[PDB]
């Protein structure tokens, strides 16, 4: 009963369905059939990875449910609700990550200055 | 893999009669059954699906009924083209198990 790993990456959403191993898994959004052959090629249900290129927060979002081949969408009782304001080339980072990168930068600056100072002391 | 056996394995039906085809299942299939028209030459087509609906191109004389286990087909005004065998197909669980059917 694993959760759906939602892999947000820029303007691209990758839903996964690892609940059913091996079986071909289809996707349904808001009780409307999605994935595979559809009107728009921005969505592709390759293996379990339901790719969502150019994700829209209002029309490509909402309910998501995975069901294996040979199982009804109404049989499944384990849904996902997705809201994700995606953004172009757009990471998400807190103040702690910026503190981490500035601490790493000042530490490697000092560690390179000491190295250059010692290699100048030697010759 | 629910076994799908008909209570009436073989019956005699007169021409121009209204004869029901009784279909039964081992367990309740939540009304997930379809009926199939197989002409004895080999060609087979979808008659009805979900025990109540009607396919496009299927004549209106074919309709199903029943809830749970005991399912039946209603066929009125049998013609010479209607003389064939009919299969109730369970569409609930993998695999879809068909039935023995009845000749007409």
């Amino acid at each position, epitope marked *: 009963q694993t959760p759906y790993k939602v892999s947000i990456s820029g303007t691209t959403v990758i839903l996964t369905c690892p609940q059913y191993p091996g079986s*071909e898994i289809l996707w349904q959004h808001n009780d409307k*059939n999605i994935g*595979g052959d559809e009107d728009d090629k921005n969505i592709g249900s390759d293996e379990d990875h339901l790719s969502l290129k150019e994700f829209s927060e209002l029309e490509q979002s909402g309910y998501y449910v995975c069901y294996p081949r040979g199982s009804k969408p109404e049989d499944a009782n384990f849904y996902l609700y997705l809201r994700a304001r995606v953004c172009e080339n757009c990471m998400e980072m807190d103040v702690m990550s910026v503190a981490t990168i500035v601490i790493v930068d000042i530490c490697i600056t000092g560690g390179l200055l000491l190295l250059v100072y010692y290699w100048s002391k030697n010759r | 893999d629910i076994q799908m056996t008909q209570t009436t394995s073989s019956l005699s039906a007169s021409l121009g009669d209204r004869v029901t085809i009784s279909c039964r299942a081992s367990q309740d299939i939540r009304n997930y059954l379809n009926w199939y028209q197989q002409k004895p030459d080999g060609t087979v087509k979808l008659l009805i699906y979900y025990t109540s609906r009607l396919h496009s191109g299927v004549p209106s004389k074919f309709s199903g009924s029943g809830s749970g286990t005991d399912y039946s087909l209603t066929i009125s005004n049998l013609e010479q083209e209607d003389i064939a065998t009919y299969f109730c197909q369970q569409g609930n669980t993998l695999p879809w198990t068909f039935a023995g059917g009845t000749k007409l």
Partner: nanobody
Amino acid sequence: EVQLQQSGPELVKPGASMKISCKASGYSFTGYTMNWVKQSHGKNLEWMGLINPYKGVSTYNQKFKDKATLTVDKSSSTAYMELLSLTSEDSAVYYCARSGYYGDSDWYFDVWGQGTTLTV
């Protein structure tokens, strides 16, 4: 008009591998799941399995996983079965049965094929 045309009798030696094509015309082949149903003994149908045409992924009956392997050709718009270790019992009629792509319509077979009587 949606049409499903198969091969003829397709005489195949016993114990060998048999192929049975199923051409798709009048519609987009990748948009509709094509199952495979076998006429056992001329009286009883049973379901072998299906193949997704858009992605090539196939799901089989648990009894008949080893009986045949379903492959498709998107360029040829044909669905193939490759029977493995067929016996005199396995000599039967094989129907290719189209259905809906998604899980709301992949369980009723809307248009069937003529059926190839695989006789030996």
